[PDB]
Amino acid sequence: SSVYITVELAIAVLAILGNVLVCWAVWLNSNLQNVTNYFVVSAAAADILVGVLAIPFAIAISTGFCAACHGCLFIACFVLVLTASSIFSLLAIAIDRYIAIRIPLRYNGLVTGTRAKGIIAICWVLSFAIGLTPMLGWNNCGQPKEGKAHSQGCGEGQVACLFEDVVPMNYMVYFNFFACVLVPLLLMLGVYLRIFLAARRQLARSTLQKEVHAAKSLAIIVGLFALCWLPLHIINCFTFFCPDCSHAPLWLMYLAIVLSHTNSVVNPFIYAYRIREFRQTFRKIIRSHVLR
Ligand SMILES: CCNC(=O)[C@H]1O[C@@H](n2cnc3c(N)nc(NCCc4ccc(CCC(=O)O)cc4)nc32)[C@H](O)[C@@H]1O
Ligand SMILES: CCCCCCCC/C=C/CCCCCCCC(=O)OC[C@@H](O)CO
Structure with a gap:
């Protein structure tokens, strides 16, 4: 339907803009050019390709x-x-x-x-x-x-x-869901838990404050990842486990697909946006670079 198309195209637009903004920032700001932000940049780059190529094909x-x-x-x-x-x-x-x-x-x-x-x-x-x-x-x-x-x-x-x-559903459930969604999710959850619980126990103050900040940033990534990816893949399980049942309706398929792509607008944008160094570089780009 035409609502699905438009929303999907709007998501593609938001994913390019925000993730170019992330990449631009690291390129200009010397203080951001560390190993950590290379993973941020790589993930941002992968998101740009989702917007330009993956979504129109989807x-x-x-x-x-x-x-x-x-x-x-x-x-x-x-x-x-x-x-x-x-x-x-x-x-x-x-x-x-x-x-x-x-x-x-x-x-x-x-x-x-x-x-x-x-x-x-x-x-x-x-x-x-x-x-x-x-x-x-x-x-x-x-x-x-x-x-x-x-x-x-x-x-x-x-x-x-x-x-x-x-694409067979047995591939989507046994291979794709496991390797791409469930395992990364559970890994990211386990990384979050360890940082979170270790930070609560100690509750010197600078290292501790960093640890709390990391926990909340990882909680947001995991929370949004699950919200964006699980609905579609869970639906995929239902289709696979009962192929005789009536298929999940078209509108639900579309919303779930749309949610999965929205991940590319929020991850890793919000992670970066939560680093004050990024946040001020963003303002610098909009306020000074493009506006003059
Ligand atoms: C690496 C993980 N990436 C993905 O999952 C990506 O693949 C795509 N996708 C993963 N599952 C699926 C999936 N079941 N159907 C689709 N489209 C087709 C939608 C559709 C399904 C059924 C029917 C018939 C309904 C009926 O009988 O009345 C019509 C349309 N795309 C997926 C997504 O774009 C995601 O971002
Ligand atoms: C963490 C990564 C997980 C890796 C495990 C992946 C291996 C799982 C194995 C699943 C057994 C299924 C393989 C069965 C291979 C079927 C290939 C085929 O001939 O097509 C059949 C389809 O057309 C039917 O729709």
Whole structure:
């Protein structure tokens, strides 16, 4: 429907603007050019690609255009790769924060500039590995829905391009949900809990205040991640566990897809926005750089 399209396009607009703003800030401000903010930048970059590429492809995938099955499958896989890199590089921020607060004596030695770039390379490789798996044969292209293609006015040699028609639900539940949503979530939760509880126990005051700040920033990332990603993936479980049941309605599918993309506007933007150094650099960019 047209409401889904517009909202989805508005999300794409917000995700580019905010995440360019994050990247711009690190580029200009010398005080922000540390290892931590490289994970912030990488995640922001992955978000820009979600806005420019993933979301327009996702709309098509969710509304339906005519295409060859493997071309239709390729576009779906592309959405998966880009949204996943968005997830993994955000997880890299959380892990960085764990090593910073809990193991400071090994932080600079362990999380070097070289290994930070290595970590981000691993994120993209995992994203391609997981995202493109259906291209290897774990897909529904062997049984094209020829009756649906007709109703959609698709030519022969083409199918109606719909995500769930080509990407199997067993892949989405057993592989994608586990590797991309559940594991990162639970990891980010475990990192948050440890920092949170350790900070409460001590409650010198400067290190403690930092620890509280980190906890609340990690709570927001985890809270929003779960809010944005769980609804869609939980729905995916329901479809998989009862494929005979009547499908979750179109409006619910759309809202859930929309929520998952909203993650790219809020993560890691709010994290950065909560660092006062970023917050003042943002104001500097708007007030001074663009306005004069
Ligand atoms: C790495 C993780 N990324 C993702 O999950 C990304 O993939 C996409 N997506 C993940 N599941 C899904 C998923 N079930 N359906 C779709 N679209 C198709 C929507 C749709 C479903 C069913 C029906 C028939 C309804 C009926 O019988 O009456 C019509 C449209 N996209 C997904 C999202 O864009 C997400 O951001
Ligand atoms: C933390 C990451 C988790 C990794 C575990 C991933 C492995 C899980 C294994 C699941 C068993 C299912 C594999 C079954 C492979 C099925 C491939 C196929 O021929 O297509 C069937 C589909 O078209 C049906 O819709």
